């Protein structure tokens, strides 16, 4: 920021270790790919020298997994299998151009 003391929020500021695995043959891997590319960038390297990043390519059918190690010592694991912003926009546009108004369940109010 311009007139500020502390920086903005960033999940990469308090991370020790990062690892990502994905299978090329599995769909919905773009998210993982982009993560890899951003993580493995020079700018990130320069900004957070204290970060250890390592990617792997799986040769077996499995979902895209992410394992991170905090500064403190805590560890967590997650899975990332979904669409990207561009794919979501294309999917939304495909349905939007149809223009078929119907009483979707969502429209309806809540009830026990």
């Amino acid at each position: 920021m311009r007139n500020a003391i502390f920086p903005r929020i960033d999940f990469l500021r308090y991370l020790k270790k990062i690892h990502v695995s994905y299978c090329p043959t599995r769909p919905k891997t773009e998210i993982a790919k982009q993560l890899i590319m951003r993580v493995t960038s020079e700018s990130v390297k320069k900004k957070f020298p204290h970060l250890q990043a390592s990617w792997e390519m799986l040769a077996y059918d499995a979902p895209a997994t992410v394992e991170v190690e905090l500064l403190d010592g805590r560890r967590v694991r997650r899975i990332i299998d979904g669409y990207s912003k561009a794919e979501k926009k294309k999917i939304v546009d495909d349905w939007r151009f149809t223009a078929n108004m119907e009483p979707w369940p969502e429209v309806l109010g809540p009830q026990p």
Binding site: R2, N3, A4, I5, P49, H50
Partner: protein
């Protein structure tokens, strides 16, 4: 409590043309202020026009105050009088405004403390400075101190972060011992 003090009244008395004395000391006023640099005469019509322009520019929500009033009377020779037949009739009223005296001021305090990158506003005073028969200079004094500044803290933090980064980078490579 606040009050609306009544302005003085013009003196209908013939007076000499003596000189303008100097100022005693600098006059300090909170908020924006406009002051002269040299001594000169100013007329009530001039002051009223400046007040009207300032009010029109600022608007009806802001408040302004005058620091000089026209009370000194001056005479003029009527058209059709001989060389010397006594003092002439009163012509107009002027105010003896020496150097350093304040003319107008807005007590309004800049609220934007953590924004020192922006200069004050002097459009209202610019709109009337050409009108005045004297050179004027803008002024804006506040209660803001150096000690109470966020710039210093920002600088300090930037330095600290730089140092930290540097240290980290040196330690990573392992070219030197630790501790």
């Amino acid at each position: 409590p606040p009050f609306r003090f009544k302005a003085p009244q013009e003196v209908r008395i013939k007076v000499p043309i003596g000189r303008i004395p100097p100022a005693v000391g600098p006059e300090i006023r909170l908020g924006k202020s406009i002051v002269a640099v040299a001594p000169h005469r100013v007329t009530a019509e001039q002051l009223e026009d400046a007040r009207r322009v300032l009010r029109r520019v600022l608007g009806r929500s802001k408040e302004v105050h005058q620091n000089v009033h026209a009370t000194y009377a001056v005479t003029r020779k009527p058209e059709g009088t001989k060389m010397g037949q006594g003092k002439g009739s009163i012509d107009r009223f002027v105010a003896r405004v020496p150097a350093g005296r304040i003319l107008f001021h807005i007590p309004q305090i800049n609220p934007f403390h953590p924004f020192p990158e922006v200069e004050p506003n002097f459009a209202a005073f610019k709109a009337i400075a050409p009108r005045l028969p004297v050179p004027v200079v803008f002024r804006e004094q506040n209660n803001f101190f150096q000690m109470h500044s966020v710039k210093d803290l920002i600088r300090k933090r930037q330095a600290e972060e730089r140092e930290n980064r540097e240290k980290t980078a040196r330690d990573k490579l392992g070219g030197f011992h630790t501790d």
